[model samples]
Target: MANPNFTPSWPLYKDADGVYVSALPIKAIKYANDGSANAEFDGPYADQYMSAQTVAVFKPEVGGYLFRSQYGELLYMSKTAFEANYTSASGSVANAETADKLSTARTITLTGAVTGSASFDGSANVTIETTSGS
Candidate 1:
């Protein structure tokens, strides 16, 4: 069983928090984690519909709030910050070096690549980068 009002267990954007923009570079998105796996980027999806995207590698459940103070911030995403804040709870919070790759709120502009193929790399392997125009 899960808590009725329990916070979601996914990554999110929050204010004053600047993660890596990636070695490739993402566009100036209003918010972070707004790409690919991120709901803000690609829109929230049901478990069944996630597979519909032929390019989709994986879709994990996400829960968090968009920051009203700054378009760049997100709040209380369990997967990203919560886990890092408390190692025992969900493992180490992603390091800044790695955070840049995983952070999905902002639009990242790729340097070497052309249209698509911009995302983080690792076991956590979360891709929220959007190549299309916002």
Candidate 2:
């Protein structure tokens, strides 16, 4: 006999909090174990579908507000101090030595490269002139 009025063991969000973004860039997302929670990223990154998603405000279900990273997405829905989270996060600033960086691909011109190539080395905001002898 399964419970009809079941609530998933999901995370609780309390309006404003921050997590240290570690080095794990991902596209994978997860739902709650009992499938009672719907976690949507207010993805202010790269402009796929954040604009329209911000509209469906179920203000009555406002039980609590905070955030967590179940599958690498910072789960928040409102426009609060989000900058502070990324500002000191690992992907943006990193704590120390190195990090998985972010790139808009602003500038990079390669003339003699193909998609067929292995294409392992990626540089950020630079010029590359690959020739045999120069």
Candidate 3:
């Protein structure tokens, strides 16, 4: 049976306090908490409340897009070419080559002397001198 209560839209707002909802039609309304903060209503009256006090939002991993982790750290974005690497059922030569390139791009070597130290005289400097790999 088709539900009559189905309203097509983004229904929830996420905030520091919690995930909440209201029948006020707008989710961003702010109002002074009437001293009692109690309600008794009839049919289809407006009301608001939190579903949970500390609900965590989901963070889906997607290619070629930047995201933040729950820890407030930046998440690593995957390369577009690397996204074509494979499926559970099959693999492609071009995708394999792309995957190889992705790994190579991540590999780095530092054959250098990195010297630096904090200085009180406002002359702090760091130097990175490199030579050909031997």
Best by TM-score: 2
Lowest lDDT block of 10, candidate 1: 20-29
Model 2, residue 71: what's the lDDT? 46
User: Could you tell me which residue pairs clash in candidate 2?
Assistant: 13-65, 13-66, 14-65, 14-66, 15-65, 15-66
- Candidate lDDT values, in order: 0.30, 0.31, 0.27
TM-score of each: 0.16, 0.19, 0.13
TM-score of 1: 0.16
Residue 70: error of model 1 in Å? 20
Model 2 misplaced stretches (Cα beyond 4 Å): 1-19, 22-35, 40-80, 86-92, 95-134
What's each prediction's clash count? 22, 6, 0
Q: Per-residue error at 93 for model 2, in Å? A: 1.1
In candidate 1, what are the lDDT values of residues 6-56, reduced to their tens digit? 354433322224431111011112322333332333323222222225214
lDDT of 2 by residue, 1-134 (tens): 13321343322222123443321122223333443334333332121222223424421122222233434454433323433443233232432332222223321233334333325544323355334356
Best by lDDT: 2
The C-alpha local distance difference test score for the whole of candidate 2 amounts to 0.31
Worst 10 residues of 3 by lDDT: 81-90
Question: What is the per-residue lDDT of model 3 for residues 1-134, given as tens digits with 9 covering 90 to 100?
Answer: 13333463523222122322222122122222442221222323333332222112222232232222233433223433222321111243223543522333332232122122223333222333122256
